[PDB]
Amino acid sequence: MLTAHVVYATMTGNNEEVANIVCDSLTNLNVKVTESEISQTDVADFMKADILVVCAYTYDEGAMPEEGLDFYDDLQSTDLTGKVYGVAGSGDKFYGEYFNTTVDHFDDAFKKAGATSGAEKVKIDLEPYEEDIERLNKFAEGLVKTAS
């Protein structure tokens, strides 16, 4: 029944770890999941899933991943009405009001595209631990219930 595409942007693996946890939780909720890195993914292919997820870092005081700028821009130009989305990220709370700003940007981009938020965005500090894992499971549960 349900499909999902999880894209991640990463440099030291934390956000790929986050994407992996989300893919696992979705798979364990009987979702067929595609997972790919953002720079190797076209929005036209991404949008074919019922559930859309971006997991991406924040850099240089609030900067988006440079390899994800095209994907980000293409996302906002696409009609994603009927799609269920969620955004998550690992970042560093030391950057204060720049903590995981990329998560906020992608959540806004999905909003302009007309997609329906399936779960509250998840902002993780550095590596995901037990609490983060439980939060990413509720995240996945929210997407499935919203999409189904």
Ligand X SMILES: Cc1cc2nc3c(=O)[nH]c(=O)nc-3n(C[C@H](O)[C@H](O)[C@H](O)COP(=O)(O)O)c2cc1C
Residues in the site for Na ion, rule: CB under 5 A? Answer: 70
Task: List the interface residues with ligand X, window 75-114 (CB under 6 A).
Answer: 90-92, 95, 98-100
Residue 14, contacted partner among ligand X, Na ion, none, CB below 5-8 A by kind: ligand X
Specify the 3-state DSSP secondary structure of 1: coil
Two tokens at 49? Answer: 């899933």
**From 28, 30, 42, 61, residue interacting with ligand X (rule: CB under 6 A):** 61
- Give the contact letters, 2-41, x = binds to ligand X (CB under 6 A), - = no: --------xxxxxx--------------------------
Question: What secondary structure does DSSP assign to 40-80, as a single string?
Answer: G--HHHHTTSSEEEEE---BTTTBPPGGGHHHHHHHHTS--
- State the residue number with the nearest CB to ligand X: 91
Residue 70, contacted partner among ligand X, Na ion, none, CB below 5-8 A by kind: Na ion
Residue with tokens 């934390």: 14
- What is the distance, to the nearest Å, from the Cα of residue 52 to the centroid of all Cα atoms in its chain? 7
Residue with tokens 């989300």: 22
Contacts to ligand X by CB under 6 A: 10-15, 57-62, 90-92, 95, 98-100, 126
